[PDB]
Design a protein around this nucleic acid. Sequence first.
DNA 1: ACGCTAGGGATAACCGGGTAATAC
DNA 2: GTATTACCCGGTTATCCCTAGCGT
Length: 223
Amino acid sequence: NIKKNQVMNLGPNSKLLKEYKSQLIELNIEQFEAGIGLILGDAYIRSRDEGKTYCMQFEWKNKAYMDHVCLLYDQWVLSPPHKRERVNHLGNLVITWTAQTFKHQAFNKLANLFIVNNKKTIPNNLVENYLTPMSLAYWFMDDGGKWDYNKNSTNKSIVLNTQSFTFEEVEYLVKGLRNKFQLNCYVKINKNKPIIYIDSMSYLIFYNLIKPYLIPQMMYKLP
DNA sequence: ACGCTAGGGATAACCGGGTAATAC
DNA sequence: GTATTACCCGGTTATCCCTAGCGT
Ligand SMILES: [Ca+2]
Ligand SMILES: [Ca+2]
Ligand SMILES: [Ca+2]
């Protein structure tokens, strides 16, 4: 075999790199299930060879969450998280962490569920067939948040920020969330765009499913 | 009198493209 | 000189959080 450490400094077209990539066949169960939530959430899955191979790009503010995701698909990620620091139009410095997998056919397994002809879509019964408690956990760590950010609140309502998807796509996601996980949720409007509102009634049932995957530095997102 | 929204803001993400390092 | 491609860019804004002030 070939160790990861031997190709953590070699160039992109390295012979030893390609032989290491041939040793890896598919994503493991944890990498696929989490991938679902990540692609629904904050991750970006892309092909440059028109569908032959795919890779995932990551960018987050939270260094620790970036570290956790990098460790997940450890064998798919060559480098440690890289730091950016950019100046925006106001003239403010913005600190963010970035990382990416190498391209590999194993990622086609994930991308074939979302990317159809360049543009990302959501299949009719995605949640019912593919979304697991682990998928919901990473999706929450990406898009999750509170409904009530007022200090001192009895409202334990969860929100999933899905402003990028169409109202139809989100409506279908709500159908899955209600049926598979018995969640009292529905679509709400924010900036003329859809979000998933989870009622405080289903908070216990939602928390129990995502407990065995949550990281401490992401516990602030919970009410 | 104050809980709870809808409205809003400066990000914290998401998109592709460019490049610099190997193979032949 | 052309193919390959992980790492690194810049464009750009929908995000997650914050809160005015509405509604009872
Ligand atoms: Ca997201
Ligand atoms: Ca996020
Ligand atoms: Ca976005």
